[PDB]
Design a binder for this molecule. Structure first.
Ligand SMILES: *[C@@H]1O[C@H](CO)[C@@H](O[C@@H]2O[C@H](CO)[C@@H](O[C@@H]3O[C@H](CO)[C@@H](O)[C@H](O[C@H]4O[C@H](CO)[C@@H](O)[C@H](O)[C@@H]4O[C@@H]4O[C@H](CO)[C@@H](O)[C@H](O)[C@H]4NC(C)=O)[C@@H]3O)[C@H](O)[C@H]2NC(C)=O)[C@H](O)[C@H]1NC(C)=O
Ligand SMILES: *[C@@H]1O[C@H](CO)[C@@H](O[C@@H]2O[C@H](CO)[C@@H](O[C@@H]3O[C@H](CO)[C@@H](O)[C@H](O[C@H]4O[C@H](CO)[C@@H](O)[C@H](O)[C@@H]4O[C@@H]4O[C@H](CO)[C@@H](O)[C@H](O)[C@H]4NC(C)=O)[C@@H]3O)[C@H](O)[C@H]2NC(C)=O)[C@H](O)[C@H]1NC(C)=O
Ligand SMILES: *[C@@H]1O[C@H](CO[C@@H]2O[C@@H](C)[C@@H](O)[C@@H](O)[C@@H]2O)[C@@H](O[C@@H]2O[C@H](CO)[C@@H](O[C@@H]3O[C@H](CO)[C@@H](O)[C@H](O[C@H]4O[C@H](CO)[C@@H](O)[C@H](O)[C@@H]4O)[C@@H]3O)[C@H](O)[C@H]2NC(C)=O)[C@H](O)[C@H]1NC(C)=O
Ligand SMILES: *[C@@H]1O[C@H](CO)[C@@H](O[C@@H]2O[C@H](CO)[C@@H](O[C@@H]3O[C@H](CO[C@H]4O[C@H](CO)[C@@H](O)[C@H](O)[C@@H]4O)[C@@H](O)[C@H](O)[C@@H]3O)[C@H](O)[C@H]2NC(C)=O)[C@H](O)[C@H]1NC(C)=O
Ligand SMILES: *[C@@H]1O[C@H](CO[C@@H]2O[C@@H](C)[C@@H](O)[C@@H](O)[C@@H]2O)[C@@H](O[C@@H]2O[C@H](CO)[C@@H](O[C@@H]3O[C@H](CO)[C@@H](O)[C@H](O)[C@@H]3O)[C@H](O)[C@H]2NC(C)=O)[C@H](O)[C@H]1NC(C)=O
Ligand SMILES: CC(C)CCC[C@@H](C)[C@H]1CC[C@H]2[C@@H]3CC=C4C[C@@H](O)CC[C@]4(C)[C@H]3CC[C@]12C
Lengths: 439, 52, 439
């Protein structure tokens, strides 16, 4: 028997479904999503890191003009300065005094620290959602890990599970992301080979060990100070460091729907968005015929306490007279209230206690214990605590549901006013009928 | 301010705290009509005024 | 200078674009797509291959009934046959004449050939396009390779190229593909863990070296045949082999747009769909000032022969006054006529010869050389060959706006009919004015 159901994607809240196979005792399955993971498939655009400005020792031509040659180095910059009179510690460098020239050259190489301290600019396309699901099957807790794309069959205890396809394709990642250590950022990094100085991606490389390096740091050489041999340069500082000091907040702190963002591999975990179709193929061995299950007659419901505290505040005590000892699956007949217990052992003439959570002002509902139903009505009070640390176990309620004795009141008011309207209609109709008799 | 969907607060390096509001009110849902409308307003302050 | 243009996404057909910088001699660039590759990002769903049935020796118990336990083997099937009287070569094996039992057990495991002969069921999400482009830059013929997703700006000879993004996201691969060796098939393979006997995917595993094998071959043990010691079995044959013998044509032969398909990695080479934006950042040193470029006068055009076929069936001869010796670009002033050559050397008072292709029955176009234009007129004859083995080089077929010469027949007919209508309208207007002018 194949049973198809839909469960909200919220993590940690169990939902119960009634598998009703005619000719067999009803079965109740409680399923809870322990973990839902969206792992996007990443195509690495490039690697950014800190650059290193390599400046070899300057050349000093004592009497004459030096010249340099262009090179294929990533950001090679050369310049010759005339009229330099550099000094070493022992005095003037050489005899010729004003004709001296200084050849100064520099370039940029991606640092060795690029192997460990780097940011990876990726593109993300789609997520292969996977789910860990806890199912209360045959009174035992079983765990199934299955891809949520609707195309993974997981068989446990001869029972087959198909999970997915998830309704909502929303993912916290956009097309282009940046990963650094354990932090994931959603930013539009500049295209490869067109980076800008002083910002993110000024120096770029396809892989951390790649030997090609696109670097744009505006490395401009300046005139050395008089009487010195240093090589000054004006350069936009490493944009990777500026980004690090000004990263902002990562995705795990700003993602919507409470998603938890992780790295290695990049994952989005527990996004409470959309819902999950679940299809369960259950073998015949798990079902019990109605004639073998207990038959319950003369059953009544009482509600000693009810508070809509989102923590199963209501309690129901039901008196039953069972045909014989056994177990039977208790299930609520309405969507407004949810029963914590999935099944109860029953024997003889006794009473059973269940705990339910609701949001109704008056908990009027029906409970299907074995194959019969019993009606419960309750006077439910609001809880005293304002805030709790767990999501509500009860479901959201519609307009007519919460109405309770206010509904009892609007019944009186509407009845009276509509009775006035009906009396007016009768008077108008009889007056019109009399009027047409006078011609 | 904790909205209906819940609020997640990260304080320093501590693990984030999660808060959800529940249906608390100073009125009563089975008393006099003014207490009724007070309860029914306090729980859902937006569309109760619309329906009333 | 930034020049943005659009070229149709075809391979082997060069296109001419005109870079017009005011104050500079016009430049013409010939771009040709050598290879456009669509590489979908594949996530391996699973591996299928030929199964091997392992059958241990049957257990013959003479004077007792054999019993076997359930085993966690992938498709373990075990049975006991009573009343067997097996024979070996030297006579009866079992002394007890009756009541003897044979215990027959067998299971399924993926064979060693799964490391070499296997089919990979993949999921395809989105392709990262790449393009190889040949550019006619400064009289040199250069080649540039770049991703075609509006990214990967690539600099060659100081010229910066930005390729794409593709105008169409069409890809020949469906969501699910199957790769065997070099043939990829658009097949909706069964979901993992839910294979069917005798079809593709009856035995599945996540990766070729995985020990996790899901096998569904409905292996059923049958009774041994009358005194033999064999263990017969009835099993659906390898669905992988049946798929091999029934593969059909792969995507290499059935894909539209003339796409070619390759594997390792999976690529869709040369898909002629949509168009391609190209952005070129030409260095200022590339351009030549108008004063230094030749200025042509006394320029006239004639056509020795024209055949409105592919492969440049038209030839034109143009006479010019070159003024200063030099070279300059040649461009067509209308799209329906395409000139093969891009630049021409002009000197003295010689004449130049150009080759052009068109679908026009009557060539009526203008040619721009060295910033001055000529009007070329020709009557073009239809070709003799019905079919050629190369794509059309002219831009396209004519539209209703462009007929041939001797369209003056249409002008004469329209003029005569409209003149009759106009004189009739004049007579009608005069008569109406007279009628309204009464009284
Ligand atoms: C301290 O700790 C940090 C954090 O872990 C370490 O950083 C890690 O460094 C590793 C070594 O570089 C990184 O691992 C790999 O390095 C490879 C070097 O060549 C690199 O190529 C890898 O990237 C490929 O593989 C990834 C995983 O499969 C893919 O996600 C990625 O996209 C690359 O895959 C290619 O993608 C292109 C896309 O165009 C395809 O065309 C190719 O076909 C793909 N090839 C393959 C084989 O898939 C990868 O980076 C590791 O990533 C990195 N950590 C993180 C979080 O990124 C420091 O090294 C460590 N310190 C020291 C001293 O070790
Ligand atoms: C005879 O010749 C055939 C080919 O003609 C050879 O087949 C090749 O065999 C190789 C080794 O067996 C294959 O190479 C790899 O094998 C890995 C075995 O573990 C396999 O895991 C690899 O697949 C993963 O890695 C790739 C690159 O990193 C990814 O592109 C690929 O998608 C897989 O990546 C993840 O895979 C897991 C699997 O569960 C998925 O869950 C993830 O979602 C995947 N992530 C991503 C991002 O994709 C890889 O296949 C090689 O592929 C194979 N050839 C072909 C065409 O497939 C035989 O070996 C050879 N035999 C002999 C004896 O010579
Ligand atoms: C740009 O690059 C080409 C060479 O590149 C090669 O060809 C490209 C189309 C492309 O595929 C590249 O990947 C590849 O590497 C330079 O020259 C082109 O090719 C030949 C080279 O000799 C030129 O001349 C040709 O020579 C043939 C042999 O003499 C001759 O028969 C051709 O004329 C006739 O050929 C065909 C038969 O195939 C015939 O049917 C026609 O009627 C045609 O007249 C041809 O003249 C080509 O002209 C060049 N290609 C083009 C499209 O013009 C090229 O020089 C280089 N650019 C520069 C500035 O040098
Ligand atoms: C139901 O009735 C309750 C009591 O009548 C309400 O509780 C009161 O709610 C009001 C507003 O909602 C609060 O007023 C605020 O008070 C804070 C400071 O008070 C708090 O901090 C001091 C610090 O010394 C502490 O001593 C107090 O006891 C409070 O804990 C102000 O800063 C605000 O501006 C504002 O005035 C009352 O404080 C609060 N009192 C109590 C005892 O709870 C309750 O809100 C009502 N519920 C509903 C749904 O209406
Ligand atoms: C099947 O599993 C459910 C819940 O799943 C469990 O949750 C984990 C935290 C672990 O406990 C795992 O064993 C398992 O995945 C079980 O229901 C849970 O049972 C526990 C103990 O039986 C309850 O803990 C108690 O909760 C009360 C509530 O007031 C506390 O006061 C106690 O101090 C104690 O912590 C837990 O509340 C309960 N949760 C729910 C949603 O019912 C279930 O018992 C289990 N069944 C079987 C047959 O294994
Ligand atoms: C006439 C007087 C005496 C009583 C009238 C009470 C009415 C106006 C009150 C009763 C409690 C209230 C409802 C209880 C539950 C729901 C469902 C929820 O999803 C939206 C709010 C909504 C729809 C409330 C709106 C206002 C409401 C209908």
């Amino acid at each position: 028997y194949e049973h198809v159901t839909v469960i909200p994607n919220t993590v940690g809240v169990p939902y119960k479904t009634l598998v009703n196979r005619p000719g067999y005792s009803p079965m109740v399955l409680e399923m809870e999503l322990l973990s839902v993971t969206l792992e996007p498939t990443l195509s690495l655009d490039y690697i950014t890191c800190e650059y290193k400005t390599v400046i070899p020792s300057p050349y000093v031509k004592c009497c004459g003009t030096a010249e340099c040659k262009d090179k294929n180095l990533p950001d090679y910059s050369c310049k010759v300065f005339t009229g330099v009179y550099p000094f070493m510690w022992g005095g003037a460098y050489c005899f010729c005094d004003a004709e001296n020239t200084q050849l100064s050259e520099a370039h940029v190489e991606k640092s060795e620290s690029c192997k460990t301290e780097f940011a990876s600019a990726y593109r993300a396309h789609t997520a292969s959602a996977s789910a860990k699901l806890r199912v209360l099957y045959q009174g035992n807790n079983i765990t199934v890990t299955a891809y949520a794309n609707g195309d993974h069959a997981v068989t446990v205890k001869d029972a087959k599970f198909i999970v997915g396809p998830m309704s909502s394709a929303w993912t916290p990642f956009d097309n282009k992301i940046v990963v650094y250590k354990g932090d994931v950022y959603n930013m539009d990094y500049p295209p490869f080979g067109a980076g800008r100085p002083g910002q993110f991606g000024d120096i770029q490389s396809r892989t951390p060990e790649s030997k090609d390096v696109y670097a744009n740091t505006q490395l401009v050489l300046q005139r050395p100070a008089a009487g010195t041999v240093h090589v000054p340069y004006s350069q936009a500082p490493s944009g990777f460091k500026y980004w690090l000091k000004e990263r902002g907040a990562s995705l795990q702190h700003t993602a919507p729907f409470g998603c938890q963002i992780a790295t290695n591999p990049v994952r989005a975990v527990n996004c409470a968005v959309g819902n999950m179709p679940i299809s369960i193929d259950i073998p015949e061995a798990a079902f019990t015929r109605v004639v073998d299950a207990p038959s319950l007659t003369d059953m009544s419901c009482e509600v000693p306490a009810c508070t809509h505290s989102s923590d199963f505040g209501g309690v129901a005590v039901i008196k039953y007279a069972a045909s014989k000892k056994g177990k039977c699956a208790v299930h609520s007949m309405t969507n407004a209230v949810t029963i914590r217990e999935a099944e109860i052992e029953v024997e003889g003439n006794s009473q059973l206690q269940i705990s339910f959570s609701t949001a109704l002002a008056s908990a009027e509902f029906r409970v299907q214990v074995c194959s019969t139903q019993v009606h419960c009505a309750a006077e439910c009070h609001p809880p005293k605590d304002h805030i709790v640390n767990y999501p509500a176990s009860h479901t959201t309620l519609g307009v007519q549901d919460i109405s309770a004795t206010a509904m009892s009141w609007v019944q009186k008011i509407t009845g009276g006013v509509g009775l006035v309207v009906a009396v007016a209609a009768l008077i108008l109709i009889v007056v019109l009928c009399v009027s047409f008799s006078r011609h | 301010t904790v909205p209906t969907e819940g609020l997640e607060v990260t304080w320093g390096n501590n693990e984030p705290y999660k808060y959800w509001p529940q249906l608390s009110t100073n009125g009563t849902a089975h008393g006099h009509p003014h207490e009724i409308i007070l309860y029914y307003y306090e729980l859902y302050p937006t569309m109760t005024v619309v329906v009333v």
